[PDB]
Amino acid sequence: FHEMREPRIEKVVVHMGIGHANAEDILGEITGQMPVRTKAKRTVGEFDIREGDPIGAKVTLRDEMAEEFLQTALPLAELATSQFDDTGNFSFGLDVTVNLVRPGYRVAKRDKASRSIPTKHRLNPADAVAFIESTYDVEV
């Protein structure tokens, strides 16, 4: 029961919301892979009239590339309780977001016969805190 219920890291999304590019170089050095540009919708009065234009960049990290980043990313910030999601995810910051979930998330991300994950199998804020606390750091 406990083996297929113990949480894991799905994706570590590292984003920099600038507004107008030059910052793509610093991400490829800290993450280990290639980054992607970020576009925007709706015309804003802060000299942002163009729709299809690079505003920032992001990198989604999987498996080893995710954990080998978090060994150096977690000590850089003081984790709080109000900094957590209802689904058991957290964002701190350069934004660093860690998506945490249980061993059967493919059921909601696949193409054939996909179903949404039930409330009981979804991660709790408390169940998430305990997992990260069990890996080199403190909570509160």
Binding site: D111, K112, A113, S114, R115
Partner: protein
């Protein structure tokens, strides 16, 4: 769900099993559908026609009933996929089916995939299915040569259960030969 005005999708769409837009375009031909479905461990190939109360399967073939002819190898790969298609096509010829259209369902039209192998097998069996030769895999990958060249990078065995050590893609040829023969009990 929310109220009387709410619109709940069709059952097979709610279940995310049938693409109804692709199904209409498929049925527009008038020919039976070569339903090519795949599982993690197995591969299925049905020959479906239309009926008054629902779909009618005239000739199916699972990769589980492939072993009945002499298969000792796994069932969810490229050689198995072709052979399930060939077995489906042969059972279709004995039913009276001459032509068919490939239904891949929710699977992707990726060049050289297992569903295109199912199609190549059915065509080889004598069925007339609209295809594209350069979207089908090269004859050696269908044999399972890509699996043998992976077993060359040995050290640790690929297969757990004892079938062999360095893998035999010659088993494909030994089975294609058995199925091409007219004596066989279908």
């Amino acid at each position: 769900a929310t109220g009387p005005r709410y619109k709940v999708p069709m059952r097979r769409r709610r279940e995310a099993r049938t693409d109804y837009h692709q199904r209409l375009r498929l049925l527009k031909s008038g020919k039976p559908r070569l339903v090519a479905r795949k599982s993690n461990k197995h591969v299925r190939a049905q020959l479906v026609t239309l009926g008054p109360n629902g779909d009618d399967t005239l000739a199916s073939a699972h990769s589980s009933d492939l072993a009945e002819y002499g298969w000792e190898a796994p069932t969810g790969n490229m050689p198995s996929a072709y052979l399930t298609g060939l077995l489906a096509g042969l059972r279709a010829q004995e039913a009276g089916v001459e032509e068919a259209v490939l239904d891949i369902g929710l699977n992707s039209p990726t060049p050289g995939s297992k569903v295109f192998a199912i199609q190549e097998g059915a065509i080889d069996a004598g069925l007339d299915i609209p295809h594209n030769d350069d979207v089908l895999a090269d004859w050696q990958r269908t044999r399972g040569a890509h699996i043998a060249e992976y077993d060359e990078q040995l050290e640790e065995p690929l297969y757990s259960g004892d079938f062999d050590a360095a893998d035999l893609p010659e088993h494909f040829d030994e089975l294609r030969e058995t199925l091409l023969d007219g004596d066989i009990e279908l």
